Amino acid sequence: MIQQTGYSKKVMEHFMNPRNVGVIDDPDGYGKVGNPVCGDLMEIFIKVGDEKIEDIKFRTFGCGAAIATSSMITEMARGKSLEEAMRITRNDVADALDGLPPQKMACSNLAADALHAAINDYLSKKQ
Amino acid sequence: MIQQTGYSKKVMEHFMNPRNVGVIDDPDGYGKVGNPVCGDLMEIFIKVGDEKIEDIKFRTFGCGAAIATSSMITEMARGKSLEEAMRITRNDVADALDGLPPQKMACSNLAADALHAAINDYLSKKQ
Ligand code: FES
Numbered sequence: 001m002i003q004q005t006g007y008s009k010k011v012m013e014h015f016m017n018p019r020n021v022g023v024i025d026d027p028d029g030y031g032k033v034g035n036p037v038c039g040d041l042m043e044i045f046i047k048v049g050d051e052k053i054e055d056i057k058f059r060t061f062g063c064g065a066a067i068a069t070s071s072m073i074t075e076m077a078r079g080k081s082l083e084e085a086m087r088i089t090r091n092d093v094a095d096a097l098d099g100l101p102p103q104k105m106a107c108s109n110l111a112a113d114a115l116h117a118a119i120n121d122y123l124s125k126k127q
Numbered sequence: 128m129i130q131q132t133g134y135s136k137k138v139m140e141h142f143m144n145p146r147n148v149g150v151i152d153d154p155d156g157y158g159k160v161g162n163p164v165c166g167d168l169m170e171i172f173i174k175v176g177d178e179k180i181e182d183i184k185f186r187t188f189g190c191g192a193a194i195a196t197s198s199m200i201t202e203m204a205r206g207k208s209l210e211e212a213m214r215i216t217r218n219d220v221a222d223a224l225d226g227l228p229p230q231k232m233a234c235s236n237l238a239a240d241a242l243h244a245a246i247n248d249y250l251s252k253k254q
């Protein structure tokens with residue numbers, strides 16, 4: 001078939017066994033981003049110690065591509081400085097996502113956009 | 128707030144720990160239904176013995192409401208006669224779903240529509 005799309009092993013691994021699902025109570029930074037098409041919401045929670053991500057959790061009721069990408073992005077963010085985590089985007093897990101249905105590119109961008117939002121929330125509370 | 132919506136404990140239980148996720152190889156009936164808005168696909172697989180559902184599995188990369196509803200519908204279908212399973216719809220788990228965002232009503236209908244499709248696939252193979 002032409003323009004074939006579908007789901008890779010790595011996305012299926014992170015959708016079936018996502019890392020860092022949950023909530024942090026009273027988090028240092030909280031970010032939430034929604035997807036305009038389906039209305040699902042991605043929420044990222046961070047604890048910050050030493051200017052670094054000491055803990056991270058995500059919560060969403062969105063689709064498999066959004067959950068797998070959040071699992072991969074939160075795992076890559078853990079332990080990074082705030083400036084390094086701000087540079088993380090789904091480009092950093094491009095190979096795992098290649099091939100996905102084209103509408104899931106937006107779903108894949110929720111995790112990094114919520115992480116950036118959580119970092120900015122924490123920074124704006126510093127001031 | 129007015130017209131409040133969100134996710135209940137029962138849906139969160141079935142999204143976090145869905146029952147009957149997987150595939151049956153060489154199934155007796157296979158049904159697949161898609162959601163027009165997001166393009167996700169729900170697939171149900173059944174094994175039929177004694178005119179009854181001897182095993183059932185679903186596979187989707189759709190959202191939390193579609194995965195929780197499939198978990199609840201496949202659990203209710205297991206062991207039922209084909210005629211009883213044909214009567215199952217998300218109405219049978221209405222109370223667990225009440226309150227969900229209104230766009231997830233379509234996501235909630237995928238499981239029973241795929242189950243009906245799998246049953247009709249098996250019947251059309253009888254003939
Ligand atoms: S379909 Fe809602 S987050 Fe992907």
Ligand code: FES
Nearest residue numbers: 165167189190234
């Ligand atoms: S948003 Fe795709 S199945 Fe619900």
